[PDB]
């Protein structure tokens, strides 16, 4: 299961993985979430990136990382 109860997700990307970031949610244009993580409910008329990962942008989910989010987070995973 991808579910991470009480710590950080930590996920790495791979190349051609989805990647979730939101302008108001996230921190800075760093701050990113996985599929397994990214929970639409919690972003509704957001304003949401979903990106294709690439060679360059290479990094981990911060679901559960408190200090890369203004909100708080409900993983898709956990439900
Ligand atoms: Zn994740
Ligand atoms: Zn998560
Ligand atoms: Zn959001």
């Given at each position: ?8 997700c ?10 979730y ?9 760093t ?6 993580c ?6 509704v ?17 911060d679901?559960?990382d ?8 409900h993983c898709?995973?956990?439900?």
């Amino acid at each position: 299961v991808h579910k991470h109860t009480g710590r950080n997700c930590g996920r790495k990307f791979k190349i051609g993985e989805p990647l979730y970031r939101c302008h108001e949610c996230g921190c800075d244009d760093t701050c990113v979430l996985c599929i397994h993580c990214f929970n639409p409910k919690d972003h509704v008329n957001h304003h949401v990136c979903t990106d294709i990962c690439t060679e360059f942008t290479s990094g981990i989910c911060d679901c559960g990382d408190e200090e890369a989010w203004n909100s708080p987070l409900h993983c898709k995973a956990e439900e």
